């Protein structure tokens, strides 16, 4: 069928020969795996910086399959997904690479983390943190229109790119709405709220969300209808779009096409 077909013709392009790629330095390693900088030969003979992702049959069909769909996304707010290659263990163990151009400004979170320091990035004026807002949404609203769901969405998995546009990317109890923690159920609005929590870092330009809550205590602290606070100097009108995302029912947020064009209203007004 044309289901099948278009499974199968997203399939075809995203795998990439492991010798057109150069692996160089580890830009961060835990358990789940490693990045690391590299170069990738493209078509016409010159080659692009890069970010390499590196994380029994079946797990694998599944990583490509899940890899073709992202790579299959166009849109200038979403990362774009450049390929794959599978790389076998010593121990027979398939090692699968994910490859995205190398972005030197980082995630997000550690951007904001970084203008609070005097050697960083200088400090982020209100209006460049609505930017960084309203690129988020608009990523999300194309992700939700095609009803993709993140699952994950937080500041520590957006991008920063060359220019300063962010992007949704991913590489975590208080980014999880209320309905999620207890039905374990996702909806996009289950999204809608991550995206509130995530408005919220960017606002408070990175601290942990619920000073004081510990993971443990948070579905009890949102049942009793508790909240993040209003950020010092965040604007009213920003507060009550994040605040929306956090409705108890999910029927009662806005959609993420809602809230971006609440946001760039709101930045198109900034004297
Ligand atoms: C919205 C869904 O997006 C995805 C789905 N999947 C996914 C999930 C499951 C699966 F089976 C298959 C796929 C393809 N992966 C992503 C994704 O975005 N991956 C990703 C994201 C970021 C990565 O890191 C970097 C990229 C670029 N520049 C960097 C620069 C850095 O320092 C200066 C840097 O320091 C650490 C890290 C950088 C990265 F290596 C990988
Ligand atoms: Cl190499
Ligand atoms: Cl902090
Ligand atoms: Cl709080």
């Known amino acids: 069928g044309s289901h099948m077909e278009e499974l199968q013709n997203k399939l075809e392009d995203v795998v990439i020969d492991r010798n057109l790629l150069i692996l160089g330095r580890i830009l961060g390693e835990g358990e789940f795996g490693s990045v690391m900088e590299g170069n990738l030969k493209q078509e016409d003979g010159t080659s692009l910086k890069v970010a390499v992702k590196t994380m029994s049959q079946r797990e694998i069909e599944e990583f490509l399959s899940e890899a073709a769909c992202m790579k299959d996304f166009s849109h200038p707010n979403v990362i774009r997904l450049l390929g794959v290659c599978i790389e076998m263990s010593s121990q027979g163990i398939p090692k699968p690479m994910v490859i995205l151009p190398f972005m030197k400004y980082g995630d997000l979170h550690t951007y904001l983390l970084y203008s609070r320091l005097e050697t960083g990035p200088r400090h982020i004026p209100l209006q460049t943190l609505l930017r960084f807002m309203v690129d988020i949404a608009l990523g999300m609203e194309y992700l939700s229109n095609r009803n993709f769901l993140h699952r994950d969405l937080a500041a520590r998995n957006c991008m920063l790119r060359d220019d300063m546009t962010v992007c949704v990317a991913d590489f975590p109890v208080k980014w999880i709405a209320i309905e999620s923690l207890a039905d374990r159920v996702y909806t996009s609005k289950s999204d809608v709220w991550a995206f509130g929590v995530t408005m919220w870092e960017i606002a408070t330009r990175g601290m942990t969300p619920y000073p004081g809550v510990q993971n443990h205590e948070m579905y009890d602290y949102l049942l009793h209808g508790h909240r993040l606070k209003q950020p010092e100097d965040c604007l009213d009108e920003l507060y009550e ?19 971006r064009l609440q946001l760039e209203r709101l930045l198109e007004s900034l004297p």
Do not use: A, E, G, Q
Not at 241 to 259: A, G, H, K, N, Q
């Open 241 to 259: 779009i994040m605040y929306s995302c956090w409705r108890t029912d999910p029927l009662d947020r806005p959609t993420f096409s809602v809230l």
